[PDB]
Design a protein around this ligand. Structure first.
Ligand code: OM7
Ligand code: ZN
Length: 197
């Protein structure tokens, strides 16, 4: 009982910059700072952008702000708090049935707008700042126009699927793997987010 440890907070360690004409990943915190911040839950770094790169002590993935909520996957964050300037912040959404969690969007972040376009021509943003065209195939699935090994998608859960106009259509959740090649992806649709809200 005196032995019991507590899990650290999720920590923002970077972002995917979609500011200009060229998407690129930026790192804002190194490994050691990440571990220190995960234990204290005190993150004093300025936050910017819509797509954050986040890490725990053992995993790294993405988190996306939509409608003032920073969304990510349960299989990445579990029930963890997220580090913030005033300490660990408790999740305001947790749905294991959707593989979905969410915190209040960090101060200084920018939120994506939920898509109302009804378009099936989507774009998946990875942690390496790749913008991958994806054709919507269902309420929660889409196919990569150019399949590639799952290695290229690993670590991008929690990243956004965007419509042509830049609206949020869903949160990247899983890849459908066929002999190691990712031909389709599964995502949490924004409407499922808007419902949980
Ligand atoms: C829908 C399932 C489908 C039928 C697939 N079948 C086949 C044959 O392909 C199929 O299983 N695919 C898998 C191939 C993996 C190989 C790598 C894939 C690469 C990128 C992928 C986007 C990524 C990702 O990047 N994670 S991550 O960021 O690296 C990480 C681990 C740090 C966080 N998601 C990803 O890895 C997921 C995680 C697992 O899925 C779920 N866990 C949970 C857990 C929960 O509580 C514990 C509650 C709900 C839940 N719901 C899921 C759907 C396995 N995942 C696959 O994608
Ligand atoms: Zn749209």
């Amino acid at each position: 009982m005196a032995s019991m440890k507590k899990k650290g907070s999720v920590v923002i360690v970077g972002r995917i910059n979609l500011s200009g004409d060229t998407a690129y990943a930026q790192q804002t915190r190194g490994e050691e700072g990440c571990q220190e911040t995960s234990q204290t839950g005190r993150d004093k770094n300025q936050v910017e952008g819509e797509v954050q790169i986040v890490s725990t002590a053992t995993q790294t993935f993405l988190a996306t702000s939509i409608n003032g909520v920073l969304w990510t996957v349960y299989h990445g964050a579990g029930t963890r708090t997220i580090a913030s300037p005033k300490g660990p912040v408790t999740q305001m959404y947790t749905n294991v049935d959707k593989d979905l969690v969410g915190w209040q969007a960090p101060q200084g972040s920018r939120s994506l707008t939920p898509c109302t376009c009804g378009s099936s021509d989507l774009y998946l943003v990875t942690r390496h700042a790749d913008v991958i065209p994806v054709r919507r195939r269902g309420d929660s699935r889409g196919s990569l126009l150019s399949p590639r090994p799952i290695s290229y998608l690993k670590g991008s859960s929690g990243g956004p699927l965007l419509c042509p106009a830049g609206h949020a259509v869903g949160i990247f959740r899983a890849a459908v793997s066929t002999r190691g090649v990712a031909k389709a992806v599964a995502f949490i649709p924004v409407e499922s987010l808007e419902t949980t809200m």
